[PDB]
């Protein structure tokens, strides 16, 4: 066996031979199109492995997202959040 999920929270230089937990804003767009093309919200959602709920979030702000890829400042805003309720 082998384990080691210690993790480290340090602010190293803006360069490293490793990926980043966070993802790019363009990634979301990739699928965003599918839905419009023809695919179904659910079909796409599961495609990557996300709850139809979240998915919608992007599609909603898709407008900006489309131009987001061009430039991005930082991820400091909640995409979606609780709202309506079905008794």
Curated annotation (Swiss-Prot):
It comes from the Eukaryota. Disruption phenotype: Flies exhibit partial transformation of antenna toward leg identity and small rough eyes. Ectopic expression causes partial transformation of distal leg structures toward antennal identity and antennal precursors into eye tissue. Residues 41-61 bind DNA. Residues 14-65 form the HTH psq-type domain. It is found in: Nucleus. Coexpressed with danr in the presumptive distal antenna, but not in the leg imaginal disk. Both proteins are also expressed in the brain and the eye region of the eye-antenna disk. First detected in early L3 eye disks in cells surrounding the newly initiated MF. Levels are uniform and high anterior to the furrow, lower levels within and posterior to the furrow. Limited expression is seen in small groups of cells in leg and wing. These appear in the location of prominent sense organ progenitors at relatively late stages of disk development. Probable transcription factor with a role in the retinal determination (RD) network. Regulates ato expression and is required for normal R8 induction and differentiation. Danr appears to repress Dan expression, but Dan is required for Danr expression anterior to the morphogenetic furrow (MF). Dan and Danr lie downstream of so and require dac function for highest levels of expression. Homomers. Interacts with itself, danr, ey and dac to form a complex (or complexes) containing the RD factors. This is Protein distal antenna. The gene is dan.
């Amino acid at each position: 066996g082998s384990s080691g999920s210690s993790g480290m929270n340090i602010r190293m230089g803006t360069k490293g031979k490793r990926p980043l937990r966070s993802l790019t804003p363009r990634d979301k767009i990739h699928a965003i199109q599918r839905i419009h093309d023809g695919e179904s919200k659910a079909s796409v959602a599961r495609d990557i492995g996300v709850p139809e709920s979240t998915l919608r979030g992007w599609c909603k702000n898709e407008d900006k997202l489309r131009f987001m890829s061009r430039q991005s400042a930082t991820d400091n805003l909640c995409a979606d959040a609780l709202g309506d309720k079905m008794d």
